[model samples]
Target: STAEQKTKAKVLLEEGSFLGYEDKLRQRLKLGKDDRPSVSLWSVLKSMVGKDMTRMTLPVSFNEPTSLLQRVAEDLEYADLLNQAASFEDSTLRLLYVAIFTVSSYASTVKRVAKPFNPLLGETFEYSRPDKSYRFFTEQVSHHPPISATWTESPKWDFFGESFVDSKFNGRSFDFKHLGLWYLTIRPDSNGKEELYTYKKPNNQVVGILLGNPQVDNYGDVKIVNHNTGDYCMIHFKARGSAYEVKGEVYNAKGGKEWIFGGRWNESVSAKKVLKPNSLEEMQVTSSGGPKYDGTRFNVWHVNERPEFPFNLTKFAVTLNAPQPHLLPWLPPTDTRLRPDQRAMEEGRYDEAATEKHRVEERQRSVRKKREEKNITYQQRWFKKEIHPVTKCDYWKFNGEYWKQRRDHKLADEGDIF
Candidate 1:
């Protein structure tokens, strides 16, 4: 109808000038030249009936079709900052706010799935674990886990920039009760050579073992000791699973000051769930009225982007009552046989057999490496020495000063450059 109308209107308009023969045209058709029909959604829907809509589906294209390998190759450069901040108790509160905002932005669009599914979706995917066949879908798929699973093929997934479909509230909200705790996992700086520890207080031991080793009893603590250096530190970590009553702050080292302490660290609500990483009360480690460790608590690092890591992971342990388990299709060893950090360095092999996509990605990475080698230059090499603005000023400055001071002190003590 629109085509016909457009043709007729064009012919009429071209026939003669309406301004010159206004009186004649007005008498013949009783119409004005300026008047035209308007288009609206309801009108389009009325015309769409009895016709296939797939033709109307949005056009699909990828921004980096051949560059997908680059996505996985880039290290989350800010990972260390996030880790350091996560160690601070206040950083947890900011992370909660960000997580809430991140999840909410994703939930805004329920009708269509968001592009670049939040890796956090993997966290949600953990909900259906133990039942591996589970698939996350929205309405229409009756047996679908109430969870949302985004297709990773879409270019919309820009890592930290992407959101999810269930992050918002529609006219009617879905119940996310089983989606209990929200967790964040950090890897050790050394590719995967560092030892990762998962501790489960007695009650959470079952889930703890499901995550990894160094399992502990209810009152006992699990410390992640760097096997490479024998330095006690936590690199890979997770929120405790629901099976255990999460309590106490997670302390670092044997006699180290408390790092992540309680603050509703494991509380999850029905429609809304708030995860406070700063509240030491929920983590079970509270300040003992001592001055040294007063305001130190776990907090989220404000990283504009994710750290660039060679591989992805699944198995991680956190000291919150019980270590939270994140079982996703793309994660590491299902039942804790390997630490996620270990699995990643082992060529990101969650299973011994590689998936077709994984193989293709590995090949692509090799090709990209060759391409980069051809363009390498001394200028680019020197550019590596330049530090980013955020870390350069405070952290790097202090680090440089401290190292210089330590070196000077050692030389003075030995009376020579020993």
Candidate 2:
């Protein structure tokens, strides 16, 4: 049965690979790039290799195996070549190379191969989604309910483009990229249908998306999907945007779209009562929370993360073209600027008003005498702590690599059992 199937497989392989005379047939058709549908069909043919071989058997019996035999001949022919590929590593690499070659070729010629009456992007309309123009462009919808989120715990906002300081879409512009896995909580509505949202990428294409509710179920399948295709986009339940409706990093280029990688849904946090101070001194005291010298848990200032969308890519591209985005301004940490550091000061004690007055006068005189340096054109200085999702510094150790590899091995092991 395996040998019989192999015969059929041989033919299928031939047709899929467009070997020998089939190449002449393809060229004869004058199938342009417009024939991508055909190319996709051919691609599908090639993708069948190394899958469940038993499924390769066609349900219908053929009067002559010629039709079936011819269909797979090319692939089997390649398989024979693969067998003679010398060794396991060589064979595996050959198969991989062929797979890539076949897939890319299919992507290139899919439209031409299918020869469908209405090709992708063709004028004739079919399909019933509300957004017709983007029908060919598959979209993934995600639902994220508002909830508490943080870039860091003990996590004061510090980095540029890493906190609410940059505000973009909803209310804030700044966001972070590449954090360990995140989680979400969801609850579905009446029709059992969940709210859908799209995360547009820097290229204006939807990359990663979700289709699920914030509601958790007894069975623990809180996330659900309606449709998914292609390996380019992947969805996982480990982290959802329920807690933070919108999340992930963008290609910080001026005109490029910020590709949304992952997100979740969560219950909104209750608003806290606002505390206000009457005077500057009161503000300082209120901000620091008292003269008795309480350490940590102090309020320097609130940083907000706002939503920025319907982004003007053209303007952004222009900005990126000239490398203007690199010119970031330093936002001093509120805690350091406002907090008292008498012991850490150069004099190691609190100076009286007279001492402070003299220092100010001496600083003014020094500034008045100071001259510009020789031809050193300096853009405004930007001070950064240089901490990010990834780090190599001893002071900023990150276990992300270990965690990722561990997670991968765990998943692979679980997959073996399943």
Candidate 3:
């Protein structure tokens, strides 16, 4: 806010330059004389208004270096929120923490509008943080409409989900509707059974595409339901006031409002206990325009400061594609880290990135044709379509052999899509 702080801030680091050490891993998605591509998105847009974006092959410049699989892994950045949620005794408070974690996951998206590389049909990614005590793995199961499944495991809790985006590019903006579901299972406390929670992300919008300065917004209803305790938290993302905002209420087993939570998704989420569930104040809770609350506010969660990196990637995102030598032996040939085009794009080799991208896509078509002629069906290696708990719907469940194969250093034939 002041010139004094502005001048002092630049002393430690220039506006966006990497200091001390420099290498290819440094942020490369920049707009400069040689770095930027002047390709018109109009060339890629089909005439149809609601064309599924996955069906189109966009320019290499239109994508960030990360894959969609890694982008989904961004949720694990706040895994501790879920860990603390598992420690809660009461179901209502636990849902509060879980709901806040969901909101926090979208904070990184608000800054990112660049599309991620679509994963190959059999491509996979693995992310583990020993400090956080969690290991996450995901695979692209299909490609026509593009569906992927993920599983995260740790001592205290398990998180897994199938992600499918019904995306359409209108004249002005891109709309990505998240049609899949996510589930979380926590260990049993001394007096309780294992708790299971389910939720889905709100639809995302990338606006200002034609206007040139692209921005991302996620707006709609997000319902977090606790199946074991009959408790649920409802959050509504408004994305109003030229920003990202959300308001939510937690309801208990009897459908009684127990708490109210509201805040900007990119900032901090705060909650207050419900004094009287049906008050007039409750009606204004969802309104971002000066709403009054009935009780004290507790700041539940706040997003960490985002650095000025390429594609507006968060700190955790920077590590997604970083060289992990420890897992080299266990990683299969189809892992996203070893993919050619994305690696070229990360290294600023647009020629190889662009050509390799189109080449692989063409190869994918040839393989599909060959399989069809042979009367063969494509199969997924790490997960299988199965029944889900509570939702009682058809879902993809992890077959649980990934870590075992990795442990034995026998990752045989995971299908080399790359």
TM-score versus the correct structure, for each prediction? 0.20, 0.14, 0.86
Q: Give the Å error, residue 285, model 3.
A: 8.0
Stretches of candidate 3 exceeding 4 Å from the true structure = 1-34, 37-49, 188-191, 239-241, 280-294
State the lDDT of candidate 3 residue by residue for 1-418, as single tens digits. 2343234234323311122112233232343223456565655553646677776666665778899999899988788887777666777877788888888888888766567888999999987664565678899988977898999876667788988988988877788898889998776343356678999999988776666666788899989888888899888998533667788988888888878888788887777778775643442332232212456666677788776775567877887886555555557888898899988887778789988888888889899999999999888899899987579977888886776666555675767677
Tell me the TM-score of model 3: 0.86
Q: In candidate 2, what are the lDDT values of residues 1-418, reduced to their tens digit? A: 2333344334333322111111111111111111111112222324344332122321111011111111111111112221211122221122222221111111111111111010111001101011111000010010011011111110100101111111111111112122222211111211221111111111001111122111221101111111111011112223222222212211211212212122221211111111221211111112334111221222211212222211111111111111111111111111011112211121222233225434534553444345233443322111122333322211221222221232233212211000
lDDT per model vs. reference:
0.22, 0.18, 0.75
Q: State in Å the error of residue 266, model 3.
A: 1.2
Tell me the spans in candidate 1 whose CA falls farther than 4 Å from its real position.
1-68, 79-225, 228-249, 252-257, 261-280, 283-292, 296-300, 305-418
Better of 2 and 3 by TM-score: 3
Model 2 stretches astray by more than 4 angstroms: 1-241, 244-296, 304-309, 312-418
lDDT of 2: 0.18
